[PDB]
Amino acid sequence: DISSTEIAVYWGQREDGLLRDTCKTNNYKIVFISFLDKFGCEIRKPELELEGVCGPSVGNPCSFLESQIKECQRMGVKVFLALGGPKGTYSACSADYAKDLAEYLHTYFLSERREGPLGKVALDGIHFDIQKPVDELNWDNLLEELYQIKDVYQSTFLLSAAPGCLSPDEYLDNAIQTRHFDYIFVRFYNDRSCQYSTGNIQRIRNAWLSWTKSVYPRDKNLFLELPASQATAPGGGYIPPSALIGQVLPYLPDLQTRYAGIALWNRQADKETGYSTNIIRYLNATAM
Template identity: 45%
Template sequence: MDTKRQALLLLLVLTIFPFTIKASSSGGIAIYWGQNLGDGTLTSTCDTGNYEIVLLAFLNVFGGGRVPSWNFAGHCGDWSPCTKLEPEIKHCQQKGVKVLLSLGGAIGSYSLSSPEDAKNVADYLNAKFLSGQSGPLGSVTLDGIDFDIEGGTNLYWDDLARELDNLRQQNSYFYLSAAPQCPRPDHYLDKAIKTGLFDYVLVQFYNNPSCQYNQANGDATDLLKSWNDWTSSVLPNNTVFMGLPASPDAAGNGYIPPNDLISKVLPIIKQTSNYGGVMLWDRFHDVGNDYSNQIKKYVKRPVLRFVTKVSEAIVGSISASLNSMFPN
């Protein structure tokens, strides 16, 4: 290959290779925390070393002029100051665990009444949870906001995502995640997810028989088909997590025994370029069933091997193109 082709090949590889690295997430576990005192503390949760993301569940009253309120099931009173979580949140972040505030949940009173209402909610979340200023959780800068919208209306969640994105572009970057049900399109979050602004899409593959694991016969066909539908429908930079119950009684149905997950599911979904890992509902059930401990080493993807394989394919394709452009 002559000097001109070598230089052009090097330039193209250096331009493309960072995107190859980004696409190859190593895989991790996200966990919801806050719905049972049996969760343990945030400190003990993060000290397990099992989790990449902890989602505080839930801010379940907001929008439409409502006074914001949360349900942390005894960890904190109903909207009493919960500044005791400040050192625990910072402890998790120091250990490299991202801590996000989850909006919504199955029980609560929340909705957005207009684009202006969405902007007001975004400004509130930014000021109270994302800016480091004094707020209900103390002076914390959470790593992002999660949309677990399962009630109210399906209006203006896309506006809220755009308003939050505007704020993170102006100030410090924070993450956005969404937790839709696995049937597509999700009733509440479809328009929001189509904005492409969510770093993480934590799809709930449970309580939805049409797109979940069939434990009765050990069949993963519907689950894997739905996974492929989701991972191919979102933007490549939207990392998808497979959301699962952490124990048989964590959800009505959809539980996958750890050995089945390890042998039948993970080897397939880890091949997806925008695979992010596994989301578990929830910490309380994970404590009782030890689920994350059993699966954590299998959730990770061998990053270097994946990057090398993709890079070799890219370089080969570029080299072939250059040979045709600059024949000897």
């Protein structure tokens, strides 16, 4: 229901501030470290670069984040690594590379097995933000390979995706049809066919409906990914918090069985506008 809303947020740029500060707000159940955005056939050991935050090009090692990640986790925040995003050159390449990459993710991010880009960590999941890949092949294979690893090691890490709001998604449909994703964060913005606009919820309600049919199993596994400010939604889709709570959420089909919460693009914008804070105030403690 609305009261059980969980909030995820994207973090990974200078303007987002500290990962620690993000987690310690208590506003978020999930933080996506964003993004591993340079990988593909001949990239044997992908390197993490967080814009203005860490990586070889910045001169501050991403491994400094290990302690912050672990404190996030200790206070119950799930920390995911997000693949892809709006920039970079990324490809799952081939069936073979999909296995190599899944193993890399497991070894270096999901198991504390070796020192990796974020230090020695076991992240809570891998998030497929496949919005601008080289192309559409092999994302299903990557997901399959990660899913199989989880079974090999009886791991608890989660797998999630962020498709666009018109179903079927051009890049992620085959992956989503495997049913291996735990969570789907549908990007209801930058698309007039399926996003909110002032006084008009029909397109977003209809798109949500479409996604409830498209995504199996029929669990509480669907989130709305939304921009946290008008400026992070140049193509539209921003939903004022009062409208989200009053005009949109109550009217989502299968709200009571499918709705898990929302994700906010991005931490900087959320800080600027107070979006999640306001959401929590309303949906949370509507009556104390």
